[PDB]
């Protein structure tokens, strides 16, 4: 129904631990753990990172973790590296049978 | 979640993890006959702290009445008060008391009015092993396990509960549709119906089939639609009680009168408000239904064949 | 996962009708849904709708006034239509699978997207 | 649904949630012998209403006939009129009446003509615990639960039904291929065949 | 053919027989071939969408012998043919015998 | 049969919350022991006395510290529970009928 609201630009030094932390509503993020994350390299197919708030598929860096609190989800990065250089888009399944997307956020190695 | 064996998907924690679950109950069959109401026992809240502390637990005896639920594999307890959650047990006992007959008390009482004769059969096996949700009442002692790390850092709920199952209902194991002869009772009362009364308690979970029942809002629909049909449930019970009564006479001597007064003073007054008129019983009237020609009835023929 | 494919009206003019088609390869539709997602420049990702084998369709409430969909199991492909294309309709369209399933009669699982396509650029 | 355990299902269709399901029936055997046709009992539509209201129930007695179906574990009831859905029960009883012998009446009639011999043997157990689909005619009282929020905002269907199962058919538990001697009838008719007739009613689901 | 063999006028084909069987359905499956006889249209309500076409209604079970136990064995015991059911009381006409044995408890 | 029983922290709640309930387990056992005892007498001859001394020295001494004061037993005291009339109790009635 409504786009999810995010910190559009984030940065840290090599090896730091930074969290993309991202906000929604009760109908999408609050009462439901249907949160997912995407990683967009320049002009490439979006890459699923985390689904069901804290589940990781195969082939993804174990450095990626998921968490939730209230209306706000999070995607934590441990040991900031080269491969982290990409956009991050969150997603959610609302109770009204619709899908939602975030503003996008971009990481930057200082 | 299911603890019997690891499952593909596990509960994601949260605020409300309640699920739609059903189970078949423990199988039971009992028949008690006596001239006084039966007695039952259940675990209820005891004599009376912080909010959420464990209730005191006590054993209570109360007269069994028509409509009182029998124990069903979750124990004989007063769910209404011992489970403030209101969702620990199936829908038909979550606000009721599951009473179990107090065989010890009824048998051991001095006069044996409450139990001339009794039969019972029970059986159940665990069908599934589940887990409970909610804040932990008492934490597991730290000396019974070694702390984990990561996912295992937090212990999972340790409040296990099984779902019963009655197994097979078979015709060879039936208790009913057979004549019970009360020629000799266990207690001192050898079948005398003091006060012109009887009390036949029956439980039979081997004929507990519910009938799915559906109706159509409109017949104009040529294709099936879920919204067009209403569903219902119903259950039907059928009973038929036959008795054989033998007349007896009592000589009213001084000693007999004193003994009968000591045992129960109501008999002597009768022979010249109702204490039990606070309970719900299936009143059965046989005042106009006595016939002396036994062979005209099936139980009478069986009685004559064997005396 | 599966393999997706993309081809459609890459170049358009205002007030035209856009037509898309995607062909699943290495797999079948199964009981999963299939949806379309676009990334207009200066925007995020906008969800369009979804369609499974049986014809059931869910649409974005704002864009459902112009979006229509259909599926065909013969060639393993599902198509899209969106009339009255404007400048804001330019975006790198994508095709994604929705492995969402129901679990326990109350709550869903695997609500993410996956099998993302490389993408196709449509400009109006 | 399958309410026995939390299962995994496809995305809900919303309308027409019907599946191809089969089950083995409850096992039964009986052999009534008398000089009058037997009597059976089944629940039917009773004495007399907005559309969709629950039909009244009544216990009806009718003569059992060749080809009348027997109780299958779904209850002895007149499915044709009590279930307008026509998909509540398997295909061979969805438009039939499942009747059960009325032993009480057939033993309590005065002359005992209808029945001077009978054996019975039946067993079953629940194999699966399913759930019905359709609008609820009687909402659960609010006193029996605490309102949910989010996923559990709307209660799931509470019309459960089990699928029977006859368990094992074995040779030692057989009633047939075995002589019965009618030397002492239960009732008053001690085997006399008035009118030069008999009526042998037999049911056997262990050779199905 | 127990009925026919027992009903024989002379009783030559069967002096003495034992039998023990047991079975229960393990699984409930479906058949694939095209339906020979369409389900009558009056036994159900026509569906729509995915349920437009009926699934195959030719069900079949897979049996199971359940448990084989030593207490239920028939063999390794002497059978005394003191009196035959029929009229032939064990006489082996023509100097022949026929012993038919089936035993699925040692398979 | 462990019986799950729970208590709510706050009763002024309209929607179900897992954090609003505390869960407990309890188990209750019920027993009733009945005995029929018969009196016996022993003649204290020299042979009987020596045999009993060999069997267990404490018998004769008690017939004038607790050795088992190292274990945890459910102590049951029946010093005041003996009654001669058997027919008044169910086990006594069964015993009488069995003779």
Numbering used by the authors:
A (entry chain L): 1 to 9, 11 to 27, 27A, 27B, 27C, 28 to 95, 95A, 96 to 106, ...
B (entry chain D): 141 to 188, 194 to 417, 452 to 486
C (entry chain H): 1 to 82, 82A, 82B, 82C, 83 to 100, 100A, 100B, 100C, ...
D (entry chain E): 141 to 188, 194 to 353
E (entry chain A): 247 to 353
F (entry chain C): 354 to 417, 452 to 486
What text comes from the article?
The HPV virion is composed of an approximately eight kb circular double stranded DNA genome, encapsidated by major (L1) and minor (L2) capsid proteins that assemble into a T = 7 icosahedral particle composed of 72 pentameric capsomers. Twelve capsomers have five neighbors (pentavalent) and 60 capsomers have six neighbors (hexavalent). The C-terminus of each L1 connects capsomers by an extension, referred to as an arm, that bridges the intercapsomer canyon, forming disulfide bonds with the neighboring capsomer and returning to the parent capsomer. Although the C-terminal arm has been shown to be immunogenic, most antibodies target sequences encoded by five surface exposed loops (BC, DE, EF, FG and HI) and because the amino acid sequences that form these loops vary by type, antibody responses tend to be type-specific or weakly cross-reactive.
We made a complex of soluble HPV16 L1 capsomer mixed with B25M05 Fab and used cryo-EM to determine the structure to a resolution of 2.9 Å. The Fab bound to the top, interior of the capsomer at the interface between the DE-loops of P1 and P2 and the FG-loop of P1, with a total BSA of ~941 Å2. The binding site of B25M05 at the apex of the capsomer sterically occludes all other binding sites, limiting the binding to only one Fab per capsomer. On P1 the DE- and FG-loop are buried by ~295 and ~234 Å2, respectively, and the DE-loop of P2 is buried by ~412 Å2. B25M05 binds with a total BSA of ~839 Å2, with ~679 Å2 from the HC and ~150 Å2 from the LC. The binding is mainly from the CDRH3, accounting for 72% of the total BSA, with some CDRH1 (8% of the total BSA) and CDRL1 (15% of the total BSA). The conserved WGSYR motif in the CDRH3 intercalates between the three variable loops, displacing the DE-loop of P1, relative to the loop orientation in the non-bound protomers. Y100C, which was shown to be most sensitive to alanine mutation, sits at the bottom of the pocket formed by the FG-loop of P1 and the DE-loop of P2. Instead of five Fabs per capsomer, B25M05 bound one Fab per capsomer at the pentameric apex. This structure has been observed with other papillomavirus binding antibodies suggesting that this is also an immunodominant public epitope.
